[PDB]
Amino acid sequence: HQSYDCVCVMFASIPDFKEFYTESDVNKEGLECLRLLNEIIADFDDLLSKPKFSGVEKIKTIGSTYMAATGLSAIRQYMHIGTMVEFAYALVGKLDAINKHSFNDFKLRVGINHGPVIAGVIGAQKPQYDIWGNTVNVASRMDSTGVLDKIQVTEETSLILQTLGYTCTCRGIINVKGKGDLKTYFVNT
Amino acid sequence: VYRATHRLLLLGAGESGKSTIVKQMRILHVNGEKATKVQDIKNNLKEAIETIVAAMSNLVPPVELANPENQFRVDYILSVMNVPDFDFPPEFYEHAKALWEDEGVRACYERSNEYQLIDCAQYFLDKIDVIKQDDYVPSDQDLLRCRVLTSGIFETKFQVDKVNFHMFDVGGQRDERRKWIQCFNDVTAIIFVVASSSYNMVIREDNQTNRLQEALNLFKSIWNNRWLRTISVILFLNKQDLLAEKVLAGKSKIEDYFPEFARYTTPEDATPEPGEDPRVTRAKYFIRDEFLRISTASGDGRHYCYPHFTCAVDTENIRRVFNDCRDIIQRMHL
Amino acid sequence: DMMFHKIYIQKHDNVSILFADIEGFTSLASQCTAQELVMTLNELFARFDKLAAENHCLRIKILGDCYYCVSGLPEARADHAHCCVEMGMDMIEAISLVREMTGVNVNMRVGIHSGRVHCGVLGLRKWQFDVWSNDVTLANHMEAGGKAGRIHITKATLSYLNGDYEVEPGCGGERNAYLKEHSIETFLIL
Ligand SMILES: Nc1nc2c(ncn2[C@@H]2O[C@H](COP(=O)(O)OP(=O)(O)OP(O)(O)=S)[C@@H](O)[C@H]2O)c(=O)[nH]1
Ligand SMILES: C=C[C@@]1(C)CC(=O)[C@]2(O)[C@@]3(C)[C@@H](O)CCC(C)(C)[C@@H]3[C@H](O)[C@H](OC(C)=O)[C@@]2(C)O1
Ligand SMILES: [Cl-]
Ligand SMILES: [Mg+2]
């Protein structure tokens, strides 16, 4: 387990899903639902192969929420953050196509932070790879307090996306349990 | 074990005819009971009459009664329209019958396409006297003609010649379609259901989008679906009676909604029902060919399409066609 | 198998689902260093992972400060309710020494429900065996509506306990909306 300086963490949940999940005898007690979830995830995973997302490194999925991070492959400067956004837009591309065939209307809700982490393996048993630190907590809280069909970034994270041709509206202020009130931005299209 | 069964899925827009088909399966292949469906018909009656009169004023031009005395009845009807647990007293029937007699009220029922109205209107109102009797027992045809909208997925088991048939019913409406996926995997075949008659009407869900187009688009959705690449779709071009009637009536012309009809000539492979009008034959097949154009353009022979001209409210034509289907299922699947 | 990707999921009735969170995880994360936190965490969960296997609990995941296992997997065990309980028993004492050691007040918030689950893997990439159902959704909420250093259990997790532990009125409906809105009789273990 080794630390980092500039890793860009992203969470993308599908809050509309938890509603849609039902457990009837008809749907094999919810198996038909987890089936559609699988399709979605897999469809998202099919992206990582794309040459342009080869720096993207999926961490886990939590429920119906996709966790992924750029710059773990490290040792112009923040071109990786811009990829992460570039990637979040792609998940929406895939989620949008599921809708078409699943007669549904799933919106994706994203939160993208960046900064120092500590990556590595945890647990004695099946040793699985994860990332820790305050960068990740905020990344997560950018998602949960997020808005559907929108990416929520923090201030500095905003400033950088600005340096790369992204326009950002201010969302307002958020109590992030631990760090307190902080200003956040939606990424415009 | 699991292969000797067949899981069939009933798809189509709202009101297409899906529930009526499962009904016909009970009538055809299944085993106090119906007294509860009486109430349901009473509401069909209520909802139907109160809908026709409400429409009268909001039409363009609006329709006047040929008996302005009937105003007080019109007044009665509208006053009870939203009552929750309706007592259905002897007046209601007297008043409903009265209005239904008013040539003006009927005239508005002709323009029933210009507003949203159930398919059991003219049928039940023609039999108010029977329904009102406290000792009323609904016919088989009455239970078929009744309308309770589908909300949710409903498994229905039947057996034909020791062979087993699972049938799932689903909401044809838009909000409801998001459940369909829960039947997609393992589906032995799709029965897509289409209100052939509804060519001159707009969906309930937005009062603007043409019902048959919504049908065409929905089929195209299913035919080219990503999880339905293998699965074949038996097409029930339902409500053939209502179609025929509209075509012969010559009120709302087809080419005035689907203008490509203007070009269409009748096919060569056409097998018209004995002494059916060349015009009805022309019409019924154009709608078939409309659907087939979508089915033709893709599939690779990985799955096929089977048309059927059908009338769900007619157990006669249903036995015939559902049988046409077991043939298909037992060739293919094996 | 051809049109849907193969799903590596399988139904499993009569299992019990523990969830365990660290109370005052932020106060700890405030005090000690960015790294020492991760080491104080990694140490504890490898300590937990021992206890799990002895108590015949298959660990699922670590989700930050949330740890959750399930007894009754992979092969069904009739002790499955006693095991998750037994698993929780240790966690509240396994934290105890690594709490005093940091001089900061942390404890474990436990929640166990029982019932059916699905378990398996989702997606194609980076598999991590997981559990999904309403019983899992409930389990999670019990921990959410738990009491510090105490084990929160359901109606059903008592019906599988065979009356071996001494419980008390839980009052989950007043600490969590999910429990209230779903009228769950909850209990605490003594
Ligand atoms: N004349 C005529 N009426 C029909 C025919 N098939 C169905 N209907 C009428 O259509 C109405 C609605 O049919 P229904 O089967 O409930 O639609 P649906 O496809 O199930 O719509 P939903 O239940 O999914 S919302 C019923 O009142 C029934 O009498 C038909 O073949 N001919
Ligand atoms: C995927 C479907 C469904 C309904 C099933 C389920 O039990 C969950 O996966 C749990 C409870 C469950 O898997 C246990 C872990 C965790 C992370 C707590 C999940 C989330 O709360 C999921 O929803 C979210 C918010 O992703 C949830 C509830 O979603
Ligand atoms: Cl239709
Ligand atoms: Mg905590």
List the helices and strands and how they pair.
The complex is a heterotrimer of chains A (189), B (334) and C (190).
Chain A: E1 2-3, E2 8-13, H1 16-20, H2 31-45, E3 56-61, E4 65-70, H3 79-102, E5 109-112, E6 118-122, E7 128-132, H4 134-144, E8 151-154, H5 155-162, E9 168-176, E10 180-187
Parallel strand pairs in A: 5-8
Antiparallel strand pairs in A: 1-6, 2-4, 2-5, 3-4, 6-7, 8-10, 9-10
Helix pairs in contact in A: 2-3
Chain B: E1 7-12, H1 18-29, H2 35-58, H3 71-80, H4 90-101, H5 103-110, H6 121-125, H7 128-132, H8 140-145, E2 154-160, E3 163-169, E4 189-195, H9 211-223, E5 233-238, H10 240-249, H11 278-296, E6 305-309, H12 315-332
Parallel strand pairs in B: 1-3, 1-4, 4-5, 5-6
Antiparallel strand pairs in B: 2-3
Chain C: E1 8-23, H1 25-31, H2 36-54, E2 57-63, E3 66-71, H3 80-100, E4 107-121, E5 130-132, H4 134-144, E6 151-153, H5 156-159, E7 167-169, H6 177-181, E8 187-189
Bound molecules: 5'-guanosine-diphosphate-monothiophosphate, forskolin (FOK), chloride ion and magnesium ion.
PDB class: lyase/lyase inhibitor
Keywords: adenylyl cyclase, gsalpha, pyrophosphate, magnesium, Alternative splicing, cAMP biosynthesis, Glycoprotein, Lyase, Membrane, Metal-binding, Phosphoprotein, Transmembrane, GTP-binding, Lipoprotein
Assembly: trimeric
Tell me what the structure shows.
The complex is a heterotrimer of chains A (189), B (334) and C (190). Chain A has five helices and ten strands. Chain A is α+β, with helices and mostly antiparallel strands and 189 residues long. Chain A has one domain: Nucleotide cyclase, GGDEF domain (Alpha-Beta Plaits), CATH 3.30.70.1230. In chain A, helix 2 packs antiparallel against helix 3. Chain A is globular, with a radius of gyration of 17 Å. A six-stranded mixed beta sheet of chain B has the order 2-3-1-4-5-6, sandwiched between helices. Chain C has one domain: Alpha-Beta Plaits. 5'-guanosine-diphosphate-monothiophosphate binds next to helix 1 and helix 10 of chain B. Magnesium ion binds next to strand 1 of chain C. The PDB classes it as lyase/lyase inhibitor.
